[PDB]
Design an enzyme around this catalytic site. Structure first.
Site, PDB file in Angstrom:
ATOM      1  N   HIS A  72     -19.096  68.304  22.432  1.00 39.87           N
ATOM      2  CA  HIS A  72     -18.697  67.272  21.476  1.00 39.87           C
ATOM      3  C   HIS A  72     -19.934  66.636  20.850  1.00 39.87           C
ATOM      4  O   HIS A  72     -20.814  66.139  21.558  1.00 39.87           O
ATOM      5  CB  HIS A  72     -17.843  66.194  22.148  1.00 39.87           C
ATOM      6  N   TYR A 201     -10.836  56.952  21.993  1.00 46.10           N
ATOM      7  CA  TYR A 201     -10.547  55.695  22.670  1.00 46.10           C
ATOM      8  C   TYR A 201      -9.758  54.796  21.724  1.00 46.10           C
ATOM      9  O   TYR A 201     -10.097  54.687  20.545  1.00 46.10           O
ATOM     10  CB  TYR A 201     -11.830  54.983  23.100  1.00 46.10           C
ATOM     11  N   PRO A 293     -13.920  54.368  34.847  1.00 42.10           N
ATOM     12  CA  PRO A 293     -14.116  55.658  34.182  1.00 42.10           C
ATOM     13  C   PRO A 293     -14.204  55.569  32.661  1.00 42.10           C
ATOM     14  O   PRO A 293     -14.390  56.602  32.017  1.00 42.10           O
ATOM     15  CB  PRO A 293     -12.882  56.457  34.610  1.00 42.10           C
ATOM     16  N   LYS A 297     -18.907  58.103  33.726  1.00 44.94           N
ATOM     17  CA  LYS A 297     -20.265  58.064  34.268  1.00 44.94           C
ATOM     18  C   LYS A 297     -20.388  58.396  35.754  1.00 44.94           C
ATOM     19  O   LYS A 297     -21.483  58.712  36.219  1.00 44.94           O
ATOM     20  CB  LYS A 297     -20.874  56.678  34.034  1.00 44.94           C
ATOM     21  N   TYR A 385     -23.974  56.747  25.680  1.00 44.82           N
ATOM     22  CA  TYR A 385     -22.853  57.660  25.860  1.00 44.82           C
ATOM     23  C   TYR A 385     -23.324  59.051  26.273  1.00 44.82           C
ATOM     24  O   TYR A 385     -22.746  59.667  27.166  1.00 44.82           O
ATOM     25  CB  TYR A 385     -22.018  57.748  24.581  1.00 44.82           C
TER      26      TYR A 385
HETATM   27  C1  LIG Z   1      -9.544  59.466  36.472  1.00 44.89           C
HETATM   28  C2  LIG Z   1     -11.030  59.644  36.724  1.00 44.89           C
HETATM   29  C3  LIG Z   1     -11.732  60.168  35.639  1.00 44.89           C
HETATM   30  C4  LIG Z   1     -13.130  60.387  35.731  1.00 44.89           C
HETATM   31  N1  LIG Z   1     -13.815  60.933  34.587  1.00 44.89           N
HETATM   32  C5  LIG Z   1     -15.222  61.164  34.649  1.00 44.89           C
HETATM   33  C6  LIG Z   1     -15.914  61.726  33.461  1.00 44.89           C
HETATM   34  O1  LIG Z   1     -15.305  61.978  32.482  1.00 44.89           O
HETATM   35  N2  LIG Z   1     -17.310  61.963  33.501  1.00 44.89           N
HETATM   36  C7  LIG Z   1     -18.046  61.638  34.722  1.00 44.89           C
HETATM   37  O2  LIG Z   1     -19.231  61.827  34.776  1.00 44.89           O
HETATM   38  N3  LIG Z   1     -17.345  61.091  35.864  1.00 44.89           N
HETATM   39  C8  LIG Z   1     -15.940  60.852  35.839  1.00 44.89           C
HETATM   40  N4  LIG Z   1     -15.275  60.319  36.978  1.00 44.89           N
HETATM   41  C9  LIG Z   1     -16.011  60.003  38.182  1.00 44.89           C
HETATM   42  C10 LIG Z   1     -15.990  61.199  39.261  1.00 44.89           C
HETATM   43  O3  LIG Z   1     -14.718  61.656  39.422  1.00 44.89           O
HETATM   44  C11 LIG Z   1     -16.512  60.742  40.622  1.00 44.89           C
HETATM   45  O4  LIG Z   1     -17.540  59.807  40.455  1.00 44.89           O
HETATM   46  C12 LIG Z   1     -17.031  61.935  41.428  1.00 44.89           C
HETATM   47  O5  LIG Z   1     -15.959  62.576  42.039  1.00 44.89           O
HETATM   48  C13 LIG Z   1     -18.005  61.519  42.544  1.00 44.89           C
HETATM   49  O6  LIG Z   1     -18.399  62.675  43.288  1.00 44.89           O
HETATM   50  P1  LIG Z   1     -18.858  62.542  44.815  1.00 44.89           P
HETATM   51  O7  LIG Z   1     -19.320  63.916  45.348  1.00 44.89           O
HETATM   52  O8  LIG Z   1     -19.974  61.565  44.915  1.00 44.89           O
HETATM   53  O9  LIG Z   1     -17.620  61.996  45.691  1.00 44.89           O
HETATM   54  P2  LIG Z   1     -16.314  62.826  46.044  1.00 44.89           P
HETATM   55  O10 LIG Z   1     -15.879  63.603  44.856  1.00 44.89           O
HETATM   56  O11 LIG Z   1     -15.239  61.883  46.465  1.00 44.89           O
HETATM   57  O12 LIG Z   1     -16.639  63.820  47.223  1.00 44.89           O
HETATM   58  C14 LIG Z   1     -16.729  63.293  48.573  1.00 44.89           C
HETATM   59  C15 LIG Z   1     -16.467  64.447  49.584  1.00 44.89           C
HETATM   60  O13 LIG Z   1     -16.728  64.063  50.798  1.00 44.89           O
HETATM   61  C16 LIG Z   1     -15.388  64.269  51.693  1.00 44.89           C
HETATM   62  N5  LIG Z   1     -15.349  63.300  52.757  1.00 44.89           N
HETATM   63  C17 LIG Z   1     -14.873  62.021  52.705  1.00 44.89           C
HETATM   64  N6  LIG Z   1     -15.017  61.456  53.930  1.00 44.89           N
HETATM   65  C18 LIG Z   1     -15.589  62.389  54.758  1.00 44.89           C
HETATM   66  C19 LIG Z   1     -15.955  62.343  56.104  1.00 44.89           C
HETATM   67  N7  LIG Z   1     -15.852  61.294  57.066  1.00 44.89           N
HETATM   68  N8  LIG Z   1     -16.514  63.431  56.691  1.00 44.89           N
HETATM   69  C20 LIG Z   1     -16.714  64.567  55.965  1.00 44.89           C
HETATM   70  N9  LIG Z   1     -16.355  64.621  54.639  1.00 44.89           N
HETATM   71  C21 LIG Z   1     -15.792  63.522  54.038  1.00 44.89           C
HETATM   72  C22 LIG Z   1     -14.410  64.180  50.858  1.00 44.89           C
HETATM   73  O14 LIG Z   1     -13.217  64.975  51.356  1.00 44.89           O
HETATM   74  C23 LIG Z   1     -14.981  64.812  49.557  1.00 44.89           C
HETATM   75  O15 LIG Z   1     -14.836  66.160  49.545  1.00 44.89           O
HETATM   76  C24 LIG Z   1     -13.821  60.081  36.898  1.00 44.89           C
HETATM   77  C25 LIG Z   1     -13.099  59.545  38.009  1.00 44.89           C
HETATM   78  C26 LIG Z   1     -11.710  59.328  37.915  1.00 44.89           C
HETATM   79  C27 LIG Z   1     -10.977  58.744  39.143  1.00 44.89           C
HETATM   80  C1  LIG Z   2     -13.833  60.326  27.651  1.00 42.82           C
HETATM   81  C2  LIG Z   2     -13.229  60.286  29.036  1.00 42.82           C
HETATM   82  C3  LIG Z   2     -12.481  61.364  29.468  1.00 42.82           C
HETATM   83  C4  LIG Z   2     -11.916  61.354  30.729  1.00 42.82           C
HETATM   84  C5  LIG Z   2     -11.105  62.545  31.174  1.00 42.82           C
HETATM   85  O1  LIG Z   2     -11.329  63.672  30.661  1.00 42.82           O
HETATM   86  O2  LIG Z   2     -10.206  62.398  32.041  1.00 42.82           O
HETATM   87  C6  LIG Z   2     -12.095  60.265  31.568  1.00 42.82           C
HETATM   88  C7  LIG Z   2     -12.842  59.181  31.134  1.00 42.82           C
HETATM   89  C8  LIG Z   2     -13.411  59.189  29.867  1.00 42.82           C
HETATM   90  O3  LIG Z   2     -14.172  58.089  29.427  1.00 42.82           O
END
Ligand SMILES: Cc1cc2nc3c(=O)[nH]c(=O)nc-3n(C[C@H](O)[C@H](O)[C@H](O)COP(=O)(O)OP(=O)(O)OC[C@H]3O[C@@H](n4cnc5c(N)ncnc54)[C@H](O)[C@@H]3O)c2cc1C
Ligand SMILES: Cc1cc(C(=O)O)ccc1O
Length: 391
Positions: A72, A201, A293, A297, A385
């Protein structure tokens, strides 16, 4: 079991760190509580900064994203009968963002890790950390009835918000910064073509709405809802009707609707812990911080954390000075807070808050009008962004 870096959690944080350390020569093993099928069962979308893109190439997991990824060059904000496109590419200086879902990124990383035979232990339960300020830190867990011990030099807490890693640090050492917003996102994933080739948005009096992509045949939509709401009170029918009411007519007209593959309500929270480390334990990703979200980020912040930890662990194991690792929290937090600020701003100007007065509404409207009408204002949005230049 013996390794150099014990990694807790096989999410995108742990996997990416794992693969980066692999290429470097640093031994590592990942412990995941759930099953691979379950982790991949997590249907989260993804917008990627170029920083994260390049980090996936460095980890050698860029092939499929180079194929299935969607670039994008801009993004749209709608408010007060207006539609304004932010030319990200032009304003940021060539930089863009990438549509490539977290689910795909997590798959790609798993494949590279399995392919290279690196160690990963799923279904590892009762994970506990030990001797963190000691010199021989170790992890204990249970799978298939047996109790195991993983010895290590360092521990990477990549186990997300509800992980055991943050809870393994003495609370007196940590300061928590938190903001809970008075609304959640009702999200709907559908096997439909996106209404726009860039995301939209929408600030509407009825509430915030968001139009987003995954593939080019899969769309992801959100509408803000009160936390008083339960997902069962929202048919696919009710969702599409509300979403359409919150969008410009010329957009709602073009909107292809359909059944929900995934339908969930997500609460909006800001969370930061300081510091992000304790002895041989380093937190990364959702284990350390949460953003709303609105800014997209969280996954990108997880990437920057891992990038920092990877490069400090390199200079540690190589240059024999595991003392630069003290600088981990300070370096990450600078970027984390800048992300929290932008994600907070984005949330603040696009959502409808309860019990706000007339002055707040006008200020919100004026914020959008100024920042979307000024070249400087547009640039502040754009550079944030696409992601500010790494540290
Ligand atoms: C609706 C939504 C939309 C989002 N959109 C974006 C986006 O567009 N762009 C962006 O950059 N970010 C986005 N995010 C943010 C992103 O989803 C999270 O920040 C990301 O998943 C973080 O990754 P992580 O590895 O740090 O944590 P997690 O993904 O939660 O991974 C943690 C892992 O550790 C495991 N675990 C937990 N506890 C234990 C334990 N005691 N022992 C062993 N394993 C364990 C879990 O099972 C899991 O597998 C969005 C989030 C949501 C909810
Ligand atoms: C642009 C955007 C997209 C998603 C998505 O693809 O779910 C989540 C948060 C956002 O700010």
């Amino acid at each position: 079991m013996k390794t150099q870096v014990a990694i807790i959690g096989a999410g995108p944080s742990g996997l990416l760190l794992g693969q980066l350390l692999h290429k470097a020569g640093i031994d590592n093993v990942i412990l995941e509580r759930q099953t691979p099928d379950y982790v991949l069962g997590r249907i989260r979308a993804g917008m990627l900064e170029q920083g994260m893109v390049d980090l996936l190439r460095e980890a050698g997991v860029d092939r499929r994203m180079a194929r299935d990824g969607l670039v994008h060059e801009g993004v749209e904000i709608a408010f007060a009968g207006q539609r304004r496109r932010i030319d990200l590419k032009r304003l940021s200086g060539g930089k863009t963002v990438m549509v490539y879902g977290q689910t795909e990124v997590t798959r790609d990383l798993m494949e590279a890790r399995e392919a290279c035979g690196a160690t990963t232990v799923y279904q590892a339960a009762e994970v506990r950390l030990h001797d963190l300020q000691g010199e021989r830190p170790y992890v204990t867990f249970e799978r298939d009835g047996e109790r195991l011990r993983l010895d290590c030099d360092y521990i990477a807490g990549c186990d997300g918000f509800h992980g055991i890693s943050r809870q393994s640090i003495p609370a007196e050492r940590l300061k928590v910064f938190e903001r809970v917003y008075p609304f959640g996102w009702l999200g709907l994933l559908a096997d439909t073509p996106p209404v726009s080739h860039e995301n939209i948005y929408a600030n509407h009096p009825r509430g915030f709405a968001l139009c987003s992509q995954r593939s080019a045949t899969r769309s992801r939509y959100y509408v803000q809802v009160p936390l008083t709401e339960k997902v069962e009170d929202w048919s696919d029918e009710r969702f599409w009707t509300e979403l359409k009411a919150r969008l410009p007519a010329e957009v709602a007209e073009k909107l292809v609707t359909g059944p929900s593959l995934e339908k969930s309500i997500a609460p909006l929270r800001s969370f930061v812990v300081e510091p992000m480390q304790h002895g041989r334990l380093f937190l990364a990703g959702d284990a350390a911080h949460i953003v709303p979200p609105t800014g997209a980020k969280g996954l990108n912040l997880a990437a920057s954390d891992v990038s920092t930890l990877y490069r400090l662990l390199l200079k540690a194991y190589r240059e024999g000075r595991g003392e630069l690792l003290e600088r981990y929290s300070a370096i990450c937090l600078r970027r984390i807070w800048k992300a929290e600020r932008f994600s907070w701003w984005m949330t603040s100007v696009l959502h409808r808050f309860p019990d706000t007065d007339a002055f707040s509404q006008r200020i919100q409207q004026t914020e959008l009008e100024y920042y979307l009408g000024s070249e400087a204002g547009l640039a502040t949005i754009a550079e944030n962004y696409v992601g500010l230049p790494y540290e």
